[PDB]
Design a protein around this motif. Sequence first.
Motif, PDB file in Angstrom:
ATOM      1  N   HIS E 406       0.809  -1.212   0.000  1.00 38.74           N
ATOM      2  CA  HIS E 406       0.000   0.000   0.000  1.00 38.74           C
ATOM      3  C   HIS E 406       0.846   1.267   0.000  1.00 38.74           C
ATOM      4  CE1 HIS E 406       0.176   1.507   4.308  1.00 38.74           C
ATOM      5  NE2 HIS E 406       0.949   0.437   4.320  1.00 38.74           N
ATOM      6  N   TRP E 407       2.113   1.180   0.408  1.00 36.52           N
ATOM      7  CA  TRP E 407       3.033   2.301   0.283  1.00 36.52           C
ATOM      8  C   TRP E 407       3.594   2.443  -1.124  1.00 36.52           C
ATOM      9  CZ3 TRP E 407       2.660   5.967   3.517  1.00 36.52           C
ATOM     10  CH2 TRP E 407       2.462   5.744   4.883  1.00 36.52           C
ATOM     11  N   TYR E 408       3.271   1.519  -2.024  1.00 34.52           N
ATOM     12  CA  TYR E 408       3.715   1.564  -3.413  1.00 34.52           C
ATOM     13  C   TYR E 408       2.572   1.758  -4.394  1.00 34.52           C
ATOM     14  CZ  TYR E 408       8.419  -0.143  -2.142  1.00 34.52           C
ATOM     15  OH  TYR E 408       9.683  -0.277  -1.620  1.00 34.52           O
ATOM     16  N   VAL E 409       1.437   1.093  -4.167  1.00 39.22           N
ATOM     17  CA  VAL E 409       0.303   1.195  -5.082  1.00 39.22           C
ATOM     18  C   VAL E 409      -0.308   2.590  -5.028  1.00 39.22           C
ATOM     19  CG1 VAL E 409      -2.021   0.318  -5.535  1.00 39.22           C
ATOM     20  CG2 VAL E 409      -0.153  -1.269  -5.075  1.00 39.22           C
ATOM     21  N   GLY E 410      -0.425   3.159  -3.829  1.00 38.48           N
ATOM     22  CA  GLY E 410      -1.006   4.480  -3.680  1.00 38.48           C
ATOM     23  C   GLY E 410      -0.117   5.617  -4.139  1.00 38.48           C
ATOM     24  N   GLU E 411       1.130   5.332  -4.512  1.00 40.43           N
ATOM     25  CA  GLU E 411       2.046   6.372  -4.958  1.00 40.43           C
ATOM     26  C   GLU E 411       2.075   6.548  -6.470  1.00 40.43           C
ATOM     27  OE1 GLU E 411       3.760   8.487  -3.010  1.00 40.43           O
ATOM     28  OE2 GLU E 411       4.827   7.423  -1.413  1.00 40.43           O
ATOM     29  N   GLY E 412       1.650   5.552  -7.242  1.00 43.69           N
ATOM     30  CA  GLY E 412       1.616   5.745  -8.679  1.00 43.69           C
ATOM     31  C   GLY E 412       1.963   4.560  -9.556  1.00 43.69           C
ATOM     32  N   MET E 413       2.313   3.420  -8.969  1.00 44.91           N
ATOM     33  CA  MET E 413       2.460   2.192  -9.733  1.00 44.91           C
ATOM     34  C   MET E 413       1.308   1.250  -9.413  1.00 44.91           C
ATOM     35  SD  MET E 413       5.342  -0.117  -7.843  1.00 44.91           S
ATOM     36  CE  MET E 413       6.685   0.837  -8.530  1.00 44.91           C
ATOM     37  N   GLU E 414       1.009   0.363 -10.353  1.00 47.12           N
ATOM     38  CA  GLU E 414      -0.030  -0.630 -10.146  1.00 47.12           C
ATOM     39  C   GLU E 414       0.540  -1.832  -9.398  1.00 47.12           C
ATOM     40  OE1 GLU E 414       0.573   0.773 -13.100  1.00 47.12           O
ATOM     41  OE2 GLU E 414      -1.240   1.915 -13.570  1.00 47.12           O
ATOM     42  N   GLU E 415      -0.331  -2.801  -9.119  1.00 47.00           N
ATOM     43  CA  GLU E 415       0.110  -4.002  -8.421  1.00 47.00           C
ATOM     44  C   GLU E 415       0.871  -4.948  -9.342  1.00 47.00           C
ATOM     45  OE1 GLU E 415      -0.008  -7.653  -5.866  1.00 47.00           O
ATOM     46  OE2 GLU E 415      -0.563  -7.386  -7.972  1.00 47.00           O
ATOM     47  N   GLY E 416       0.662  -4.838 -10.655  1.00 45.23           N
ATOM     48  CA  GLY E 416       1.280  -5.746 -11.604  1.00 45.23           C
ATOM     49  C   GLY E 416       2.766  -5.537 -11.816  1.00 45.23           C
ATOM     50  N   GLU E 417       3.321  -4.406 -11.372  1.00 38.50           N
ATOM     51  CA  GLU E 417       4.755  -4.175 -11.531  1.00 38.50           C
ATOM     52  C   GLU E 417       5.574  -5.098 -10.638  1.00 38.50           C
ATOM     53  OE1 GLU E 417       2.628  -1.669 -11.808  1.00 38.50           O
ATOM     54  OE2 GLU E 417       3.224  -0.619 -13.638  1.00 38.50           O
ATOM     55  N   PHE E 418       4.996  -5.549  -9.523  1.00 41.43           N
ATOM     56  CA  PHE E 418       5.686  -6.521  -8.682  1.00 41.43           C
ATOM     57  C   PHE E 418       5.744  -7.888  -9.351  1.00 41.43           C
ATOM     58  CE2 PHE E 418       4.164  -3.349  -5.610  1.00 41.43           C
ATOM     59  CZ  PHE E 418       5.352  -3.059  -4.969  1.00 41.43           C
ATOM     60  N   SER E 419       4.756  -8.202 -10.190  1.00 41.88           N
ATOM     61  CA  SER E 419       4.711  -9.521 -10.810  1.00 41.88           C
ATOM     62  C   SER E 419       5.627  -9.602 -12.028  1.00 41.88           C
ATOM     63  CB  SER E 419       3.274  -9.873 -11.192  1.00 41.88           C
ATOM     64  OG  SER E 419       3.220 -11.111 -11.876  1.00 41.88           O
ATOM     65  N   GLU E 420       5.851  -8.485 -12.724  1.00 39.89           N
ATOM     66  CA  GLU E 420       6.731  -8.543 -13.888  1.00 39.89           C
ATOM     67  C   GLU E 420       8.190  -8.351 -13.506  1.00 39.89           C
ATOM     68  OE1 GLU E 420       5.385  -5.599 -16.596  1.00 39.89           O
ATOM     69  OE2 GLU E 420       5.281  -3.991 -15.106  1.00 39.89           O
ATOM     70  N   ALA E 421       8.463  -7.858 -12.290  1.00 43.93           N
ATOM     71  CA  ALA E 421       9.848  -7.639 -11.878  1.00 43.93           C
ATOM     72  C   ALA E 421      10.480  -8.930 -11.383  1.00 43.93           C
ATOM     73  CB  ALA E 421       9.899  -6.543 -10.801  1.00 43.93           C
ATOM     74  N   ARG E 422       9.775  -9.682 -10.529  1.00 44.92           N
ATOM     75  CA  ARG E 422      10.316 -10.972 -10.117  1.00 44.92           C
ATOM     76  C   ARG E 422      10.265 -12.032 -11.208  1.00 44.92           C
ATOM     77  NH1 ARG E 422       5.520 -15.956  -9.204  1.00 44.92           N
ATOM     78  NH2 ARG E 422       4.392 -14.211  -8.477  1.00 44.92           N
ATOM     79  N   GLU E 423       9.302 -11.937 -12.172  1.00 46.28           N
ATOM     80  CA  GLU E 423       9.326 -12.885 -13.258  1.00 46.28           C
ATOM     81  C   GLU E 423      10.509 -12.636 -14.178  1.00 46.28           C
ATOM     82  OE1 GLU E 423       4.943 -14.703 -14.427  1.00 46.28           O
ATOM     83  OE2 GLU E 423       5.295 -12.536 -14.378  1.00 46.28           O
ATOM     84  N   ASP E 424      10.917 -11.377 -14.319  1.00 50.43           N
ATOM     85  CA  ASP E 424      12.147 -11.059 -15.035  1.00 50.43           C
ATOM     86  C   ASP E 424      13.368 -11.612 -14.305  1.00 50.43           C
ATOM     87  OD1 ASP E 424      14.073  -9.760 -16.689  1.00 50.43           O
ATOM     88  OD2 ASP E 424      12.638  -8.147 -17.069  1.00 50.43           O
ATOM     89  N   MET E 425      13.362 -11.548 -12.971  1.00 49.13           N
ATOM     90  CA  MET E 425      14.508 -12.011 -12.197  1.00 49.13           C
ATOM     91  C   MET E 425      14.535 -13.536 -12.096  1.00 49.13           C
ATOM     92  SD  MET E 425      15.809 -10.891  -8.455  1.00 49.13           S
ATOM     93  CE  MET E 425      16.768  -9.708  -9.391  1.00 49.13           C
ATOM     94  N   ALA E 426      13.361 -14.176 -12.033  1.00 47.93           N
ATOM     95  CA  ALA E 426      13.303 -15.636 -12.036  1.00 47.93           C
ATOM     96  C   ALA E 426      13.805 -16.204 -13.358  1.00 47.93           C
ATOM     97  CB  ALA E 426      11.879 -16.115 -11.757  1.00 47.93           C
ATOM     98  N   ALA E 427      13.547 -15.501 -14.461  1.00 52.30           N
ATOM     99  CA  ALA E 427      14.171 -15.864 -15.728  1.00 52.30           C
ATOM    100  C   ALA E 427      15.671 -15.601 -15.690  1.00 52.30           C
ATOM    101  CB  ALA E 427      13.518 -15.098 -16.877  1.00 52.30           C
TER     102      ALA E 427
END
Lengths: 17, 54, 436, 428, 439
Positions: E406-427
Amino acid sequence: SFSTPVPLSLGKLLPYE
Amino acid sequence: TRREFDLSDPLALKKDLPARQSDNDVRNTISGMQKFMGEDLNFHERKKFQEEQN
Amino acid sequence: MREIVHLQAGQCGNQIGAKFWEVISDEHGIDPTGTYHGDSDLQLERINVYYNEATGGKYVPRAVLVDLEPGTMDSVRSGPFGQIFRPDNFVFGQSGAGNNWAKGHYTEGAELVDSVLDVVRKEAESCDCLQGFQLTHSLGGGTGSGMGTLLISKIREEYPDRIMNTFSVVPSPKVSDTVVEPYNATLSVHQLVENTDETYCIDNEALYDICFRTLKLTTPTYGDLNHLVSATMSGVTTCLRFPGQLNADLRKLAVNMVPFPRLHFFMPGFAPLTSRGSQQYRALTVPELTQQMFDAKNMMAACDPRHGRYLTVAAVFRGRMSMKEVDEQMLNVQNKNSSYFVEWIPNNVKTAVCDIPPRGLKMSATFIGNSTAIQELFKRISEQFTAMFRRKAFLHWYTGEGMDEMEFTEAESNMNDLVSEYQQYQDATAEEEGEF
Amino acid sequence: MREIVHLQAGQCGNQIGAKFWEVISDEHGIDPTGTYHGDSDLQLERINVYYNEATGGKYVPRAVLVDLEPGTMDSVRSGPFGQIFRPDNFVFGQSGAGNNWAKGHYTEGAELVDSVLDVVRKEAESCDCLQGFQLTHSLGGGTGSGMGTLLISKIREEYPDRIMNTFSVVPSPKVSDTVVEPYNATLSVHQLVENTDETYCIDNEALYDICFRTLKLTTPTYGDLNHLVSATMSGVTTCLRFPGQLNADLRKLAVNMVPFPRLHFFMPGFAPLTSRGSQQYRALTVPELTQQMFDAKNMMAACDPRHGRYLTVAAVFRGRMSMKEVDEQMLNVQNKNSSYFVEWIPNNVKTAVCDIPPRGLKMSATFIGNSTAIQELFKRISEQFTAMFRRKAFLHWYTGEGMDEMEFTEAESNMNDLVSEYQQYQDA
Amino acid sequence: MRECISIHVGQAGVQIGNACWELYCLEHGIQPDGQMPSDKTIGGGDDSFNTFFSETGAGKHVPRAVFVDLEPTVIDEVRTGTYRQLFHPEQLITGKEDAANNYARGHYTIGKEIIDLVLDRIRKLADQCTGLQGFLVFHSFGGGTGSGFTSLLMERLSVDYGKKSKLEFSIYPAPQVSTAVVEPYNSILTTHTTLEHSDCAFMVDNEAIYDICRRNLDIERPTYTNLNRLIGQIVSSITASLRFDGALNVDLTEFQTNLVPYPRIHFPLATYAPVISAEKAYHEQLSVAEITNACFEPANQMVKCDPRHGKYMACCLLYRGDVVPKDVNAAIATIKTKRTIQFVDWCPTGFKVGINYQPPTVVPGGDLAKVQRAVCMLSNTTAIAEAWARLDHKFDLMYAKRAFVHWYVGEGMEEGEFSEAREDMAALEKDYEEVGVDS
Ligand SMILES: Nc1nc2c(ncn2[C@@H]2O[C@H](COP(=O)(O)OP(=O)(O)OP(=O)(O)O)[C@@H](O)[C@H]2O)c(=O)[nH]1
Ligand SMILES: Nc1nc2c(ncn2[C@@H]2O[C@H](COP(=O)(O)OP(=O)(O)O)[C@@H](O)[C@H]2O)c(=O)[nH]1
Ligand SMILES: Nc1nc2c(ncn2[C@@H]2O[C@H](COP(=O)(O)OP(=O)(O)O)[C@@H](O)[C@H]2O)c(=O)[nH]1
Ligand SMILES: [Mg+2]
């Protein structure tokens, strides 16, 4: 002296004055 | 004669002060929290004077 | 440049606030008349955080003092350090609240807030970049909890993108001196949980306990109790006013502590406190601060963290000092106390170091602890309110001022949801993911 | 580095510790105020073993004082060396036990252990590498025995891989000044045998016998008795502080003196004890130390190894000296008396040498002895216990405080098994 | 010519830049006023300072550095301190109300605010460069400005400049000690956007330099002001081949090619040797073989990771001082015949050597000794996959039930940015093991 309003007040001495 | 030597001085614990050397410390003020108002240093004198008054 | 507007509510708030302005004017080197008499040049580099420039090199505080009884306002005026305040900021009524939350929130305090918000708006708009507000009040009274919570609700609607601290004096069971304390308490906790960013629970038992067995103090007067309260509240924002090696203001502290917006009830504590007969037998070293900061004796609430789990913690250090020991000692207490710290979040300790120490001390530290053990106070308030509201005791003093009986029922449901909300996080499995 | 945490329990524990901190502060050169005032550099090299560091070059002892009566605490603080202790280390209860083991171990001692385990954990975690603990207590009174056994029982699981020493004032038949004293002795040996690395038996009969026969003092006050026992207690941990040609710390003594885990009851002695009239006439020579030690009068217990077998023997010497005469004399005393040593352990002798002598003395020695003669002591306690328990004497002071009758039965049976275990090495 | 522009961003940037630029002035004979002494000012006065210092007709020498921070309480020490008259007043950019340890705050709300001003000063400093080697970026992963503002700094710098060299000197989060809590959130979101916009990224963490200062320098509690001196020594050794001559010359674009073999793997580790006490230098003679075996030793590694658990992929050696080319190669051949050090099978040659004539300079009040020779090493190792595996552990165990989101979503990014960042790192984690498997 500080607590009374500006109306309903006799002329008193304010603190630090 | 190396910079930041006081952090690594072995005798730093020897060349130090306890900050309450006496009750009349000039450096002990209200923001330093080692002197308190409730330390009744005149407690027994006040008690003796109260006994005399009674 | 980063201004904190100070808010004082009630008789208890004014006694705390008067000592707070005394303790930091000495820190910044300000005489009671108002000028500057110091020895360093960095004391005026960042002084607009709490002070406002006047003519002739005079500094006046950015504080407003609010009460519903004029007896306290003259005392805080004619006190030891009451001359520095602007007399406009003293706003007061003529009839007291009467230890009644309904008078302060609905009838008596509803007319005083028009004068207060005009002064607050006038003083907050003058800042070039407002940082946030700060309130000191007690939940056991009528003019501090009845009207202070109304000031909470109006300000949060007007200034949403701002950070608000409060210093709530949570009521105490053992040294309670007012019968209607749980009435005033549980009707205000709902306002603090919804519309407040940080809440610090300061309890009079712990102030008495620190003053008895730690300071070995003979007569713990209210000035001595407020001496400890002004300690943490001066030290929590010392990275704003003084440069350091690792700087962290109260917003960065807010980010690292609060995982969910309903969890903001913290516990303060001041580390370097010694007695007169034991100070010269003790060396001042970073492990000695960490040991005296983390034990349950120095916690300033009636919470034992042994019953709960530490959720997220702070240490704000002061003094010129090498922070290997800062980076090592809290790691050591992290690895040892495995059960007390929740394993759902790794390395929850937040660290800040400020270069400038308090006056007369070479080293100091401050603690902020978010724990689940705070829920035992709300449960104690719940059971004392349940046992008395069930018989409709003292109810005509509250229901005769316009509020119906369902406000008590929803106040019960909001606090029972709060104590259950802490309970799930205390007993939660980290190595699992749910339906979401 | 290697640090020893001191424990004092009861009035006897406080008196024996006040004299012990009096004699080793003089050994390390410490004034009554606390500041170091020395003449060499070897004294300052190892101070952290017993002292902490404070502001202004002060040293406070790593000791905690435990009592259930503030009367003895005031005399300790008002003594010559009462200013050196930190006031936080004093722990006192407002209601004593009264020579009762049940009060100290079940009811009254349960509330007071939360403060002591708070304080002892507070300063033992400050050690970079804690070497071990140390306890002094008396079995003749329930203040330091009822809770003194409970402090041992609580510290064992908390700090498992450590070593702890205890100095037990084992009661005497002729200096028996309390009636319920066999109850206090028997119920505490049961707890002592299972949770202790090393035990010492000090008896006031032997302390009175030494000061009569050897020192020729007309008035043997308790200060003279505390002088005699602390001259051995300082003498057992000398290799840790003062370097020597052959070092031996407390763990090195324990591994060579405890062959079986239930056999750790040792009885000590001190060699160079001389009267003032005989001080002028003795000669300071290496065989003089071992001949005045292996004399059966010089021991510090109410038992004789002539009735038993020397299981293992340790000698710690003080003073810059030649060790060939040390090896020659101790071999000579081992071979000349071929009946007082067991057949199944050759080389029953552990030897250590320290360079720095005690202050005001040229050479000195300290001896630790494990023998079968300790079972004479345990049977003497057990025969008086079974002569007075069987008529249910003084039982209402114990069965009414939360103790059933089975604790007395298991305390006798465990002591009966212990003397049988000691007896089997007398023959085999 | 031979110019490179250094940007110091965040609190970690300006504190390192204080000790780094102090070393540069003393090395070139510059006082904090800024004029070279008249014994060394000739019209043929040596122009070796043009890599870092610009020139003014009066005699002033302005550094080519940009100081970026979002909180003014760390730049005011620079403005008030000893080097007040050295730095340009417009090159110390500061803001208000900081970032409060947040990636979203420093990338979207506060970060986008102060990026038009920074890119203006970059243009004003890159227009004086006759030949520009590249940009050096000094930052930390944990902080809000070092994670948030540097994430879109590369986005705009790749737009403004196409193929220019971009080097990172980044404070990686230590596996044990950290000053923050939402630091793993910043470290996922930084690397996710830095992967395709960074050319090379050197790796250091505080606790691994902490062990070096405790053992190898005879000090028991250093702080940040003597921890940045070692980092300033490494970056001095990197750019000393441009500033002074040598038998072998190495530019900025040399080890970018020689250490990055694949588009997703640009994380080498920077080690330095000999780090020795001045009393200890009395007993130890420093040979070429003595100082190059200390670089390969896992105890002197400046990243808390053991290279024995993985395989080396590339190495870069930069020698300074009195060295001969024969002793370098006898020592290198000794290294290759040891079986503790393991190279991958598709890299039969994993070395690059640079030789510099000038010995490292000493600073008054410093910790190191005045030595004759030294070597710094930039080695890329497969054994840094355990660092991501532990750091993915701390992210997943914290993101297990959506803590601090909630300290990240309310500032201007969506929730999906967390899912594409770790999927990039898991690759990227599967990418590291695929490279490391032998044929
Ligand atoms: N090695 C090293 N690390 C540093 C130094 N200064 C700060 N750091 C690192 O920086 C981290 C703290 O974050 P910062 O980069 O200071 O934060 P910031 O850039 O100011 O961003 P915000 O504080 O969120 O506004 C710590 O964990 C340190 O590890 C330094 O001088 N040397
Ligand atoms: N810590 C602290 N507590 C105080 C102080 N003054 C009053 N209190 C507490 O506040 C409670 C009463 O608060 P009250 O005056 O009725 O609050 P108000 O009506 O809002 O002004 C008492 O139980 C006191 O213990 C103070 O200076 N410091
Ligand atoms: N050797 C020796 N024995 C002592 C000393 N003080 C007391 N005692 C013995 O201890 C017994 C009483 O101990 P007591 O005070 O009841 O111990 P407590 O109950 O733990 O406080 C007496 O029989 C004494 O003989 C001493 O200083 N030295
Ligand atoms: Mg910052």
